[PDB]
CSV table of C-alpha atoms and ligand atoms in Angstrom, one decimal:
chain,number,residue,atom,x,y,z
A,1,UNK,CA,14.2,-16.5,-8.2
A,2,UNK,CA,14.3,-18.7,-11.4
A,3,UNK,CA,13.8,-16.2,-14.4
A,4,UNK,CA,11.8,-17.6,-17.1
A,5,UNK,CA,9.3,-16.5,-19.9
A,6,UNK,CA,5.7,-17.6,-20.4
A,7,UNK,CA,3.8,-16.4,-23.4
A,8,UNK,CA,6.1,-13.3,-23.8
A,9,UNK,CA,5.8,-12.2,-20.1
A,10,UNK,CA,8.8,-12.5,-17.9
A,11,UNK,CA,8.2,-14.6,-14.8
A,12,UNK,CA,10.5,-15.0,-11.7
A,13,UNK,CA,9.5,-17.4,-9.0
A,14,UNK,CA,11.1,-18.9,-5.8
A,15,UNK,CA,9.5,-21.9,-4.3
A,16,UNK,CA,9.6,-21.9,-0.2
A,17,UNK,CA,8.2,-23.9,2.8
A,18,UNK,CA,5.4,-21.7,3.9
A,19,UNK,CA,1.6,-21.7,3.5
A,20,UNK,CA,1.6,-18.1,2.2
A,21,UNK,CA,2.4,-16.9,-1.3
A,22,UNK,CA,3.1,-13.5,-2.6
A,23,UNK,CA,2.3,-12.9,-6.2
A,24,UNK,CA,3.3,-9.4,-7.6
A,25,UNK,CA,2.9,-7.9,-11.1
A,26,UNK,CA,5.6,-5.3,-11.5
A,27,UNK,CA,4.8,-2.7,-14.3
A,28,UNK,CA,7.1,-0.5,-16.1
A,29,UNK,CA,4.9,2.4,-15.4
A,30,UNK,CA,6.2,4.5,-12.6
A,31,UNK,CA,6.2,8.2,-12.4
A,32,UNK,CA,9.3,8.6,-14.7
A,33,UNK,CA,7.4,7.3,-17.5
A,34,UNK,CA,4.3,9.3,-16.7
A,35,UNK,CA,2.8,11.3,-19.6
A,36,UNK,CA,0.7,13.4,-17.4
A,37,UNK,CA,1.8,14.3,-13.6
A,38,UNK,CA,0.2,11.8,-11.4
A,39,UNK,CA,-1.0,9.4,-13.9
A,40,UNK,CA,1.1,6.5,-12.4
A,41,UNK,CA,-0.4,7.1,-9.1
A,42,UNK,CA,-4.0,7.0,-10.6
A,43,UNK,CA,-3.2,3.9,-12.6
A,44,UNK,CA,-2.0,2.1,-9.5
A,45,UNK,CA,-5.2,3.2,-7.7
A,46,UNK,CA,-7.4,2.0,-10.6
A,47,UNK,CA,-6.1,-1.6,-10.1
A,48,UNK,CA,-8.8,-3.9,-9.1
A,49,UNK,CA,-11.6,-1.7,-10.0
A,50,UNK,CA,-14.3,-2.9,-12.2
A,51,UNK,CA,-13.1,-5.3,-14.9
A,52,UNK,CA,-15.6,-6.8,-17.5
A,53,UNK,CA,-15.4,-10.3,-16.1
A,54,UNK,CA,-15.5,-9.4,-12.4
A,55,UNK,CA,-16.6,-6.2,-10.5
A,56,UNK,CA,-14.5,-4.4,-7.9
A,57,UNK,CA,-17.2,-5.6,-5.4
A,58,UNK,CA,-17.2,-9.2,-6.4
A,59,UNK,CA,-13.4,-9.2,-6.4
A,60,UNK,CA,-13.2,-7.8,-2.8
A,61,UNK,CA,-15.9,-10.3,-1.5
A,62,UNK,CA,-14.1,-13.3,-3.0
A,63,UNK,CA,-10.8,-12.1,-1.8
A,64,UNK,CA,-12.2,-12.1,1.7
A,65,UNK,CA,-13.3,-15.8,1.3
A,66,UNK,CA,-9.7,-16.8,0.4
A,67,UNK,CA,-8.5,-14.5,3.2
A,68,UNK,CA,-6.1,-12.8,0.8
A,69,UNK,CA,-4.8,-9.3,0.8
A,70,UNK,CA,-3.9,-6.6,-1.7
A,71,UNK,CA,-1.0,-4.2,-1.8
A,72,UNK,CA,-0.3,-1.6,-4.3
A,73,UNK,CA,2.3,1.1,-4.7
A,74,UNK,CA,3.9,3.4,-7.2
A,75,UNK,CA,7.6,4.2,-7.3
A,76,UNK,CA,9.6,6.4,-9.8
A,77,UNK,CA,10.3,3.3,-11.8
A,78,UNK,CA,7.3,1.0,-11.2
A,79,UNK,CA,3.8,0.3,-10.3
A,80,UNK,CA,3.7,-2.8,-8.1
A,81,UNK,CA,0.5,-4.8,-7.4
A,82,UNK,CA,0.9,-7.5,-4.8
A,83,UNK,CA,-1.4,-10.3,-3.6
A,84,UNK,CA,-0.8,-12.3,-0.5
A,85,UNK,CA,-2.7,-15.5,-0.3
A,86,UNK,CA,-2.6,-19.3,0.7
A,87,UNK,CA,-0.3,-21.3,-1.7
A,88,UNK,CA,-3.1,-23.4,-3.2
A,89,UNK,CA,-5.1,-20.3,-4.3
A,90,UNK,CA,-2.5,-19.3,-6.9
A,91,UNK,CA,-4.7,-19.9,-10.0
A,92,UNK,CA,-7.4,-17.4,-8.8
A,93,UNK,CA,-4.8,-14.6,-8.2
A,94,UNK,CA,-3.1,-15.3,-11.6
A,95,UNK,CA,-6.5,-14.9,-13.3
A,96,UNK,CA,-7.3,-11.8,-11.2
A,97,UNK,CA,-4.3,-10.0,-12.5
A,98,UNK,CA,-5.0,-11.1,-16.1
A,99,UNK,CA,-8.5,-9.5,-15.7
A,100,UNK,CA,-6.9,-6.2,-14.5
A,101,UNK,CA,-4.5,-6.0,-17.2
A,102,UNK,CA,-6.7,-7.1,-20.1
A,103,UNK,CA,-10.2,-6.0,-19.2
A,104,UNK,CA,-10.3,-2.9,-16.9
A,105,UNK,CA,-13.3,-0.8,-17.7
A,106,UNK,CA,-12.0,2.6,-16.9
A,107,UNK,CA,-15.1,4.4,-15.9
A,108,UNK,CA,-15.5,8.1,-15.2
A,109,UNK,CA,-17.5,7.5,-12.0
A,110,UNK,CA,-14.7,5.2,-10.7
A,111,UNK,CA,-12.3,7.9,-11.3
A,112,UNK,CA,-14.4,10.7,-9.5
A,113,UNK,CA,-15.8,8.8,-6.7
A,114,UNK,CA,-13.4,5.9,-5.9
A,115,UNK,CA,-9.9,6.3,-7.3
A,116,UNK,CA,-9.0,9.9,-7.2
A,117,UNK,CA,-10.2,10.4,-3.4
A,118,UNK,CA,-8.3,7.5,-2.4
A,119,UNK,CA,-5.3,8.8,-4.3
A,120,UNK,CA,-5.8,12.2,-2.3
A,121,UNK,CA,-6.0,10.6,1.1
A,122,UNK,CA,-2.8,8.5,0.1
A,123,UNK,CA,-0.8,11.7,-0.5
A,124,UNK,CA,-2.2,13.6,2.5
A,125,UNK,CA,-1.0,10.8,4.7
A,126,UNK,CA,2.4,10.7,3.3
A,127,UNK,CA,2.8,14.5,3.5
A,128,UNK,CA,1.9,14.4,7.2
A,129,UNK,CA,5.7,13.4,7.5
A,130,UNK,CA,7.7,16.7,6.4
A,131,UNK,CA,10.7,14.5,5.7
A,132,UNK,CA,8.6,12.9,2.9
A,133,UNK,CA,7.9,16.2,1.3
A,134,UNK,CA,11.4,17.3,1.6
A,135,UNK,CA,12.9,14.4,-0.2
A,136,UNK,CA,10.0,14.6,-2.9
A,137,UNK,CA,10.8,18.4,-3.4
A,138,UNK,CA,14.6,17.6,-3.6
A,139,UNK,CA,13.9,15.0,-6.6
A,140,UNK,CA,12.0,17.7,-8.4
A,141,UNK,CA,14.8,20.4,-8.1
A,142,UNK,CA,17.5,17.8,-9.1
A,143,UNK,CA,15.8,16.2,-12.0
A,144,UNK,CA,13.0,18.6,-13.1
A,145,UNK,CA,11.2,15.9,-15.3
A,146,UNK,CA,11.4,12.1,-15.5
A,147,UNK,CA,12.8,11.4,-12.2
A,148,UNK,CA,11.6,14.7,-11.2
A,149,UNK,CA,8.0,14.3,-11.8
A,150,UNK,CA,5.9,13.9,-8.8
A,151,UNK,CA,5.2,10.3,-7.9
A,152,UNK,CA,1.7,11.2,-6.6
A,153,UNK,CA,-1.3,12.8,-8.0
A,154,UNK,CA,-1.9,16.4,-6.9
A,155,UNK,CA,-4.9,18.7,-6.9
A,156,UNK,CA,-3.3,21.4,-8.9
A,157,UNK,CA,-2.8,19.0,-11.9
A,158,UNK,CA,-6.0,17.0,-12.5
A,159,UNK,CA,-5.6,13.6,-14.2
A,160,UNK,CA,-8.5,12.9,-16.6
A,161,UNK,CA,-10.0,9.6,-17.6
A,162,UNK,CA,-8.6,10.0,-21.0
A,163,UNK,CA,-4.9,10.4,-19.6
A,164,UNK,CA,-5.3,7.4,-17.4
A,165,UNK,CA,-6.8,5.3,-20.3
A,166,UNK,CA,-4.1,6.3,-22.7
A,167,UNK,CA,-1.3,5.4,-20.1
A,168,UNK,CA,-2.9,2.2,-19.3
A,169,UNK,CA,-2.8,1.3,-23.1
A,170,UNK,CA,0.9,1.7,-23.1
A,171,UNK,CA,1.8,0.1,-19.7
A,172,UNK,CA,-0.7,-2.7,-19.7
A,173,UNK,CA,1.2,-4.7,-22.2
A,174,UNK,CA,3.5,-7.8,-22.3
A,175,UNK,CA,6.6,-5.6,-22.8
A,176,UNK,CA,6.1,-3.8,-19.6
A,177,UNK,CA,4.9,-6.4,-17.3
A,178,UNK,CA,6.8,-8.7,-15.0
A,179,UNK,CA,5.4,-11.4,-12.7
A,180,UNK,CA,7.2,-12.2,-9.5
A,181,UNK,CA,6.1,-15.1,-7.3
A,182,UNK,CA,7.5,-15.5,-3.7
A,183,UNK,CA,6.8,-19.0,-2.3
A,184,UNK,CA,5.2,-20.0,-5.6
A,185,UNK,CA,6.3,-23.2,-7.4
A,186,UNK,CA,8.1,-21.7,-10.5
A,187,UNK,CA,6.9,-24.4,-13.0
A,188,UNK,CA,3.2,-23.9,-12.0
A,189,UNK,CA,3.4,-20.1,-12.2
A,190,UNK,CA,4.8,-20.4,-15.8
A,191,UNK,CA,2.1,-22.6,-16.8
A,192,UNK,CA,-0.7,-20.4,-15.4
A,193,UNK,CA,0.7,-17.1,-16.6
A,194,UNK,CA,1.1,-18.7,-20.1
A,195,UNK,CA,-2.6,-19.4,-20.4
A,196,UNK,CA,-3.8,-16.4,-18.6
A,197,UNK,CA,-1.7,-13.5,-20.1
A,198,UNK,CA,-1.7,-14.9,-23.7
A,199,UNK,CA,-4.1,-12.5,-25.2
A,200,UNK,CA,-2.5,-9.3,-23.6
A,201,UNK,CA,-1.2,-6.9,-26.3
A,202,UNK,CA,2.5,-7.1,-26.9
A,203,UNK,CA,2.7,-3.3,-27.1
A,204,UNK,CA,6.0,-1.4,-26.8
A,205,UNK,CA,8.6,-0.6,-24.1
A,206,UNK,CA,7.4,2.5,-22.3
A,207,UNK,CA,10.2,5.1,-22.3
A,208,UNK,CA,11.1,8.3,-20.3
A,209,UNK,CA,10.4,11.4,-22.6
A,210,UNK,CA,13.8,13.0,-22.7
A,211,UNK,CA,17.0,12.2,-21.2
A,212,UNK,CA,17.9,12.4,-17.4
A,213,UNK,CA,19.3,15.9,-16.7
A,214,UNK,CA,20.8,17.0,-13.4
A,215,UNK,CA,20.3,20.4,-11.9
A,216,UNK,CA,21.2,22.0,-8.6
A,217,UNK,CA,19.0,24.5,-6.6
A,218,UNK,CA,16.6,25.2,-3.8
A,219,UNK,CA,13.0,24.2,-2.9
A,220,UNK,CA,11.1,26.1,-0.2
A,221,UNK,CA,7.9,24.5,0.8
A,222,UNK,CA,5.9,26.6,3.5
A,223,UNK,CA,4.0,24.1,5.7
A,224,UNK,CA,2.6,24.8,9.2
A,225,UNK,CA,3.0,21.1,9.9
A,226,UNK,CA,6.5,20.4,11.0
A,227,UNK,CA,10.0,21.1,9.7
A,228,UNK,CA,12.4,19.2,7.6
A,229,UNK,CA,15.5,19.7,5.3
A,230,UNK,CA,17.0,17.7,2.7
A,231,UNK,CA,20.5,18.0,1.4
A,232,UNK,CA,20.8,16.1,-1.8
A,233,UNK,CA,23.6,15.7,-4.3
A,234,UNK,CA,22.6,14.4,-7.8
A,235,UNK,CA,24.9,11.6,-9.1
A,236,UNK,CA,25.7,11.3,-12.8
A,237,UNK,CA,27.4,8.1,-12.6
A,238,UNK,CA,25.5,5.8,-10.1
A,239,UNK,CA,28.1,3.6,-8.4
A,240,UNK,CA,27.5,0.9,-5.6
A,241,UNK,CA,29.9,2.7,-3.2
A,242,UNK,CA,27.2,5.3,-2.3
A,243,UNK,CA,25.2,2.4,-0.5
A,244,UNK,CA,28.2,1.9,1.6
A,245,UNK,CA,28.7,5.7,2.0
A,246,UNK,CA,24.9,6.1,2.9
A,247,UNK,CA,25.1,3.3,5.6
A,248,UNK,CA,28.4,4.6,7.1
A,249,UNK,CA,27.0,8.2,7.4
A,250,UNK,CA,24.0,6.4,8.9
A,251,UNK,CA,21.8,8.6,11.1
A,252,UNK,CA,19.2,6.4,12.8
A,253,UNK,CA,20.1,4.5,16.0
A,254,UNK,CA,20.6,0.9,16.2
A,255,UNK,CA,19.3,0.3,19.6
A,256,UNK,CA,16.5,1.9,21.7
A,257,UNK,CA,16.8,5.0,23.7
A,258,UNK,CA,20.3,5.7,22.1
A,259,UNK,CA,21.6,8.3,19.7
A,260,UNK,CA,24.0,6.1,17.7
A,261,UNK,CA,27.6,5.9,16.8
A,262,UNK,CA,27.2,7.1,13.2
A,263,UNK,CA,28.6,10.4,12.1
A,264,UNK,CA,25.1,11.9,11.3
A,265,UNK,CA,23.7,10.4,14.4
A,266,UNK,CA,26.4,12.2,16.6
A,267,UNK,CA,25.4,15.4,14.7
A,268,UNK,CA,22.0,15.4,16.5
A,269,UNK,CA,23.4,15.4,20.2
A,270,UNK,CA,21.6,18.0,22.2
A,271,UNK,CA,18.7,18.3,19.8
A,272,UNK,CA,15.4,16.6,19.4
A,273,UNK,CA,16.1,16.0,15.6
A,274,UNK,CA,16.6,12.9,13.5
A,275,UNK,CA,18.7,12.4,10.5
A,276,UNK,CA,19.0,9.8,7.6
A,277,UNK,CA,21.3,9.5,4.8
A,278,UNK,CA,19.9,7.7,1.6
A,279,UNK,CA,21.1,6.7,-1.7
A,280,UNK,CA,18.8,6.2,-4.7
A,281,UNK,CA,19.9,4.5,-7.8
A,282,UNK,CA,17.8,5.0,-10.8
A,283,UNK,CA,20.2,3.3,-13.3
A,284,UNK,CA,21.2,6.3,-15.3
A,285,UNK,CA,21.3,8.9,-12.4
A,286,UNK,CA,21.3,8.8,-8.7
A,287,UNK,CA,20.7,10.8,-5.6
A,288,UNK,CA,22.5,11.1,-2.3
A,289,UNK,CA,20.3,12.7,0.3
A,290,UNK,CA,20.6,13.5,4.0
A,291,UNK,CA,17.2,14.5,5.4
A,292,UNK,CA,16.8,16.1,8.8
A,293,UNK,CA,13.5,16.6,10.6
A,294,UNK,CA,12.8,18.2,13.8
A,295,UNK,CA,10.4,20.6,15.6
A,296,UNK,CA,12.9,23.4,16.1
A,297,UNK,CA,14.1,25.2,12.7
A,298,UNK,CA,17.1,26.5,14.8
A,299,UNK,CA,18.2,23.0,15.6
A,300,UNK,CA,17.6,21.7,12.1
A,301,UNK,CA,19.9,24.4,11.0
A,302,UNK,CA,22.4,23.5,13.5
A,303,UNK,CA,22.4,19.8,12.5
A,304,UNK,CA,22.5,20.7,8.8
A,305,UNK,CA,25.9,22.4,9.2
A,306,UNK,CA,27.2,19.4,11.3
A,307,UNK,CA,25.9,17.1,8.5
A,308,UNK,CA,27.8,18.9,5.7
A,309,UNK,CA,30.9,18.9,7.9
A,310,UNK,CA,30.6,15.1,8.6
A,311,UNK,CA,30.4,14.5,4.8
A,312,UNK,CA,33.8,16.8,4.3
A,313,UNK,CA,35.4,14.9,7.2
A,314,UNK,CA,34.5,11.6,5.6
A,315,UNK,CA,36.2,12.9,2.3
A,316,UNK,CA,39.3,13.3,4.4
A,317,UNK,CA,39.7,10.1,6.3
A,318,UNK,CA,38.0,6.9,7.2
A,319,UNK,CA,39.4,4.4,9.6
A,320,UNK,CA,39.6,0.6,8.7
A,321,UNK,CA,37.1,0.0,11.5
A,322,UNK,CA,34.6,2.4,10.0
A,323,UNK,CA,34.8,1.0,6.5
A,324,UNK,CA,34.3,-2.4,8.0
A,325,UNK,CA,31.1,-1.1,9.9
A,326,UNK,CA,30.0,0.3,6.5
A,327,UNK,CA,30.3,-3.1,4.9
A,328,UNK,CA,28.4,-4.7,7.7
A,329,UNK,CA,25.6,-2.2,7.9
A,330,UNK,CA,25.3,-2.2,4.1
A,331,UNK,CA,25.1,-6.0,3.7
A,332,UNK,CA,22.5,-6.0,6.4
A,333,UNK,CA,20.4,-3.3,4.6
A,334,UNK,CA,20.6,-5.3,1.3
A,335,UNK,CA,19.6,-8.5,3.0
A,336,UNK,CA,16.5,-7.1,4.7
A,337,UNK,CA,15.4,-5.2,1.3
A,338,UNK,CA,15.5,-8.6,-0.5
A,339,UNK,CA,13.2,-10.1,2.3
A,340,UNK,CA,10.6,-7.3,2.5
A,341,UNK,CA,8.1,-8.3,-0.2
A,342,UNK,CA,7.4,-4.8,-1.1
A,343,UNK,CA,11.1,-3.9,-2.1
A,344,UNK,CA,11.9,-7.6,-3.2
A,345,UNK,CA,9.3,-7.5,-6.0
A,346,UNK,CA,10.7,-4.2,-7.5
A,347,UNK,CA,14.4,-5.5,-7.1
A,348,UNK,CA,13.6,-8.7,-9.4
A,349,UNK,CA,11.1,-6.5,-11.4
A,350,UNK,CA,14.1,-4.4,-12.3
A,351,UNK,CA,16.2,-7.3,-13.3
A,352,UNK,CA,13.3,-8.7,-15.5
A,353,UNK,CA,12.1,-5.4,-17.0
A,354,UNK,CA,15.3,-3.4,-17.3
A,355,UNK,CA,18.0,-6.1,-17.2
A,356,UNK,CA,20.0,-4.9,-14.2
A,357,UNK,CA,21.1,-8.2,-12.7
A,358,UNK,CA,20.5,-8.1,-8.9
A,359,UNK,CA,23.3,-8.0,-6.5
A,360,UNK,CA,22.7,-10.6,-3.9
A,361,UNK,CA,23.3,-9.4,-0.3
A,362,UNK,CA,26.2,-12.0,0.1
A,363,UNK,CA,27.8,-10.3,-2.9
A,364,UNK,CA,27.7,-6.9,-1.6
A,365,UNK,CA,31.1,-5.4,-2.3
A,366,UNK,CA,33.6,-4.4,0.5
A,367,UNK,CA,34.8,-0.8,0.1
A,368,UNK,CA,38.2,0.1,1.3
A,369,UNK,CA,38.6,3.4,3.3
A,370,UNK,CA,40.1,4.8,0.2
A,371,UNK,CA,37.2,4.1,-1.9
A,372,UNK,CA,34.7,5.4,0.6
A,373,UNK,CA,36.7,8.6,1.3
A,374,UNK,CA,36.9,9.3,-2.5
A,375,UNK,CA,33.2,8.8,-2.9
A,376,UNK,CA,32.5,11.3,0.0
A,377,UNK,CA,35.1,13.8,-1.6
A,378,UNK,CA,33.2,13.7,-4.9
A,379,UNK,CA,30.0,14.6,-3.1
A,380,UNK,CA,31.2,17.5,-1.0
A,381,UNK,CA,32.7,19.0,-4.1
A,382,UNK,CA,29.7,18.7,-6.3
A,383,UNK,CA,28.7,21.5,-8.7
A,384,UNK,CA,24.9,21.0,-8.2
A,385,UNK,CA,23.9,20.7,-4.4
A,386,UNK,CA,20.1,20.7,-4.0
A,387,UNK,CA,18.5,21.9,-0.8
A,388,UNK,CA,14.7,21.4,0.1
A,389,UNK,CA,13.4,23.0,3.2
A,390,UNK,CA,10.0,22.4,4.5
A,391,UNK,CA,8.1,24.2,7.2
A,392,UNK,CA,9.3,27.5,8.6
A,393,UNK,CA,11.2,28.0,5.5
A,394,UNK,CA,12.4,31.5,6.5
A,395,UNK,CA,14.3,30.0,9.5
A,396,UNK,CA,15.7,27.1,7.6
A,397,UNK,CA,19.2,27.1,5.8
A,398,UNK,CA,20.0,27.8,2.3
A,399,UNK,CA,22.3,26.0,-0.2
A,400,UNK,CA,24.9,28.9,-0.2
A,401,UNK,CA,25.0,28.9,3.5
A,402,UNK,CA,26.0,25.2,3.5
B,1,UNK,CA,-4.7,-25.8,-6.4
B,2,UNK,CA,-8.0,-23.9,-6.1
B,3,UNK,CA,-9.3,-21.9,-9.2
B,4,UNK,CA,-12.3,-20.3,-7.8
B,5,UNK,CA,-13.8,-19.7,-4.2
B,6,UNK,CA,-16.5,-22.2,-3.3
B,7,UNK,CA,-20.0,-20.4,-2.6
B,8,UNK,CA,-23.6,-20.3,-3.4
B,9,UNK,CA,-26.3,-17.6,-3.1
B,10,UNK,CA,-28.9,-18.5,-0.7
B,11,UNK,CA,-32.5,-17.3,-1.7
B,12,UNK,CA,-33.5,-14.0,-0.2
B,13,UNK,CA,-36.3,-11.4,-0.2
B,14,UNK,CA,-36.4,-7.8,1.1
B,15,UNK,CA,-33.1,-8.7,2.8
B,16,UNK,CA,-34.2,-11.7,4.7
B,17,UNK,CA,-33.0,-15.3,4.2
B,18,UNK,CA,-34.1,-18.6,5.7
B,19,UNK,CA,-31.0,-19.0,8.0
B,20,UNK,CA,-31.6,-15.6,9.7
B,21,UNK,CA,-35.5,-15.9,9.9
B,22,UNK,CA,-35.3,-19.4,11.2
B,23,UNK,CA,-33.1,-17.9,14.2
B,24,UNK,CA,-36.1,-15.6,14.9
B,25,UNK,CA,-39.0,-18.1,14.8
B,26,UNK,CA,-38.8,-19.0,18.5
B,27,UNK,CA,-38.8,-15.3,19.3
B,28,UNK,CA,-42.0,-14.7,17.3
B,29,UNK,CA,-43.4,-17.6,19.3
B,30,UNK,CA,-42.6,-15.9,22.7
B,31,UNK,CA,-43.9,-12.7,21.4
B,32,UNK,CA,-47.1,-14.4,20.4
B,33,UNK,CA,-47.5,-15.9,23.8
B,34,UNK,CA,-46.8,-12.4,25.4
B,35,UNK,CA,-49.6,-11.0,23.0
B,36,UNK,CA,-51.9,-13.9,23.9
B,37,UNK,CA,-51.4,-13.6,27.7
B,38,UNK,CA,-51.8,-9.8,27.5
B,39,UNK,CA,-54.9,-9.9,25.3
B,40,UNK,CA,-56.6,-12.5,27.5
B,41,UNK,CA,-55.6,-10.5,30.6
B,42,UNK,CA,-57.2,-7.5,29.0
B,43,UNK,CA,-60.5,-9.2,28.5
B,44,UNK,CA,-60.5,-11.2,31.6
B,45,UNK,CA,-63.4,-9.1,33.0
B,46,UNK,CA,-65.7,-9.8,29.9
B,47,UNK,CA,-68.2,-12.4,31.0
B,48,UNK,CA,-67.8,-14.4,27.8
B,49,UNK,CA,-64.1,-14.7,28.3
B,50,UNK,CA,-64.8,-16.1,31.8
B,51,UNK,CA,-67.6,-18.4,30.5
B,52,UNK,CA,-65.8,-19.7,27.4
B,53,UNK,CA,-62.2,-19.8,28.3
B,54,UNK,CA,-61.2,-19.1,31.9
B,55,UNK,CA,-63.7,-21.1,33.8
B,56,UNK,CA,-62.8,-24.2,31.7
B,57,UNK,CA,-59.2,-24.2,33.0
B,58,UNK,CA,-58.5,-27.1,35.2
B,59,UNK,CA,-58.3,-26.5,39.0
B,60,UNK,CA,-57.9,-22.6,38.6
B,61,UNK,CA,-61.1,-22.3,36.6
B,62,UNK,CA,-63.4,-22.3,39.7
B,63,UNK,CA,-62.0,-18.7,40.3
B,64,UNK,CA,-64.4,-17.5,37.6
B,65,UNK,CA,-67.5,-19.5,38.5
B,66,UNK,CA,-69.3,-17.0,40.9
B,67,UNK,CA,-73.0,-16.6,41.3
B,68,UNK,CA,-74.9,-13.7,42.8
B,69,UNK,CA,-77.5,-15.1,45.1
B,70,UNK,CA,-81.0,-14.6,43.8
B,71,UNK,CA,-81.9,-12.7,47.0
B,72,UNK,CA,-79.3,-10.0,46.3
B,73,UNK,CA,-80.1,-9.6,42.6
B,74,UNK,CA,-82.5,-6.8,41.6
B,75,UNK,CA,-82.3,-8.0,38.0
C,1,LIG,C1,-46.2,-7.6,22.0
C,1,LIG,C2,-45.1,-6.7,21.4
C,1,LIG,C3,-44.4,-7.2,20.1
C,1,LIG,C4,-43.1,-6.7,19.7
C,1,LIG,C5,-42.6,-7.7,18.6
C,1,LIG,C6,-41.2,-7.7,17.9
C,1,LIG,C7,-41.0,-8.7,16.8
C,1,LIG,C8,-39.6,-8.3,15.9
C,1,LIG,C9,-38.8,-9.5,15.4
C,1,LIG,C10,-37.8,-8.9,14.6
C,1,LIG,O1,-37.3,-7.8,14.6
C,1,LIG,O2,-37.1,-9.9,13.7
C,1,LIG,C11,-36.0,-9.6,12.9
C,1,LIG,C12,-35.9,-10.6,12.1
C,1,LIG,C13,-34.8,-10.7,11.1
C,1,LIG,O3,-33.7,-10.2,11.6
C,1,LIG,P1,-32.7,-8.9,11.3
C,1,LIG,O4,-32.6,-9.0,9.7
C,1,LIG,O5,-33.2,-7.8,11.8
C,1,LIG,O6,-31.3,-9.4,12.0
C,1,LIG,O7,-37.2,-10.4,11.3
C,1,LIG,C14,-37.7,-11.7,10.6
C,1,LIG,O8,-37.2,-12.7,10.8
C,1,LIG,C15,-39.0,-11.5,9.6
C-alpha cells in the first residue's frame, strides 16, 4: 500500500491483478471517541442514507446496476465503510463516499424508521453469542470510559439526531478520514480523491475525552440465552509478545473433529466447551482475554480453573518447540488479517490516521521461550484481573476464586 | 473508467410500461377470441344470429338453414 496525500486526505492503495476492487473509507470515529454512548454505531448505520445529491433509494438501485456491495462496521477505534465493485467503476464509488461525508441530510425520520431499528437488530444478532457479550462486558469493567464505552447503541441510552449530527460534524472532516483502496491503481485514486474530497471541512483530530485508565473487577450479566466467561487482564504497556502468547495459548482446533494441541484447547477435554485467547492492542492500552463458552456453567467453571493454571504454567516454562509453534501460529494470524478486507482496511487506517507503522506478516518477531514465559508471568501476577460472567451467573466463577 | 451507471427511465402510467404491456397484447387477443366465441355461442339460438352470421359460414353454415314445412306450421 503506497501511502500518499490527496487534497489533505491520506490515501493508501495497492494495485493488483483481479477484476474486483475494494474501496474503504476509514474514519477516526470509533466508540472510544464517542461523545454519547452508541453514537459511533449510529453514525456507521447512517452512512449511505439520503444525501443532498443522491437519495438512499437511488444509491441502492444504482449500486445493483454495478453489482457492487456495501459493508460497514464500527470498532473501538474506527468506523469503516467499504465498497466492493468492478475495477472500472472506481469514480462512481469515490463520488459516493464524497456525497456521504459532505452532504448527508441527517433526517429525523431516517433515524427513527431506518437507522435506529437496523442498529438494534445488529446488536441483538451479536448478543445471541454469549461470548460476544462477555468480551464486551470485560472491556467495560477494564476501561470504564473510552475503550470502555459500548461499541453498539443500546436502548437504555437513546442517541438523538442532535447527538449524531454533532459527532458527524467532528468525524466527517479531512483530519479524521483515510481512504484505502485494495486492487485500485494508486495514481488514479489520488486523482479522484483529490477532486471529490477537496471541499470537505478540514476540521480537527477527534480525541478521547480523558486518558485511558485501567481497572479490575467483575461483571455479571444474567441472560437465559447461553453461558460464557471472559477472564481479561488489562495491559498498561501493549507489547507485540502478547500476540505470540495469545496464539500459543490458542484455544480453537486447527483441524476438524479434534480438540487441538494448544494449552487452552487441552483444558476443554471432557467438556462441550470452547475457549479462545485474544489480545487487543489499542495503542495506549491493551487487553488480554480468555473467553470460554459452553452450555454447562459447571463445565465452564471447570475450564476456567484450568485456563488460569495454563497461564501460570506458561509463566514457569515454555519449550523451544512451543515457542516456534507460537511464531508460526502468530505469523499466520497476521497474514490472514492483512488479507481479509475488513481487518486490512483498519490496519492501514491505523497507520494513516494514527501513525502506527504496520508490521508486515513477514516481519513478525520471533519470541524466545524466555520472552514468552516472562509475558505470561506478568499476566498471572496482574493487580487488576477482570472477570465477566454471562448466563447463569450464580453458577459461574468469581475473580477471587480464580 | 465509468463515472455513472448507464440507464434511462421508460415512460410509464399507473405502473404500466410498454415493454410489459406488449407482452400481454397477444393474451388480450386470445381472451377476446374466448369472449367472442362465448358470446356467439350464447346467442346461437337467436334467429338473427343464425340468419346474419352463422348461416353464412362456408360448409358448416347449412346447419342453421332449416325450414318448417308449411303443412306443419300453424302460424
Ligand atoms: C373472458 C374472461 C376475461 C378474463 C380477462 C383477463 C385479462 C387480464 C390481463 C392482465 O392481467 O394483464 C396484466 C397486464 C400487465 O401485467 P402486470 O403488470 O400485472 O404484470 O395488464 C396490461 O397489460 C394492461
